[PDB]
Amino acid sequence: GSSCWQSNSAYEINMAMGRVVVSPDLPVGSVIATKTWTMPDNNTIYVTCDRNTTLKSDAKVVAAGLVQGANKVYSTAIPGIGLRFSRKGAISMIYPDSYTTTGSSFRLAGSTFTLDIIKTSTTTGSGTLASGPYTEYGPGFTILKTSLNADAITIVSPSCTIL
């Protein structure tokens, strides 16, 4: 059997979006905010093998406190706040998914990575998203990772209270 190792450390995207204010008029399911990062088409090899090998790469959402709902939208610890991760380019997929190809050297195809903030419920809460990993793509090991720092995405929907 073939052996495949990781020739280079993973490509990383910090998904910092800053402060976002949710409008009450925004209908359910629609986009609150979106952000797109590009990765230039590269000569760098992330996976290398000894033989010609057929590999299956999985696109994984790994962040704790995220449950997958319908249409690949992930609910949050923040009420009525959804997340959708997508990649567009030569290889295009909405997380989660998996890609299969064959070769002995493997590059990352120049592409765009897109984070979507979705309105899950008619009533939306407030808060800051947790620090750490969110996305992991690779053939049994991460070659493409997306994550957040502290205070990189703050969602503030104005509340109407009783008096």
Strands 144-148 and 111-119: unpaired
Q: How many helices (H) and strands (E) does the chain have?
A: 0, 15
Q: What is the DSSP letter of 26?
A: S
Count of the separate structural domains present in the chain:
1
Residue 12: CATH number of its domain? 2.60.40.3310
Prior bond to 96 cis, omega within 30? yes
Query: Structural domain of residue 83, as residue ranges?
Result: 1-163
Query: ∠105-107-108 over CA atoms, to 5°?
Result: 155
Distance CA 20, CA 126 (A): 10
Euclidean distance between CA atoms 132 and 77, whole angstroms: 15
* Resolved by: X-ray
* In contact, 130 and 64? CB cutoff 8 Å: yes
Q: What is the DSSP letter of 72?
A: G
- What is the CB neighbour count within 10 angstroms for residue 43? 5
| Structure resolution, Å | 3.0
Is the four-CA dihedral 87, 93, 97, 99 of positive or negative sign?
negative
Residue 32, both tokens? 């609150």
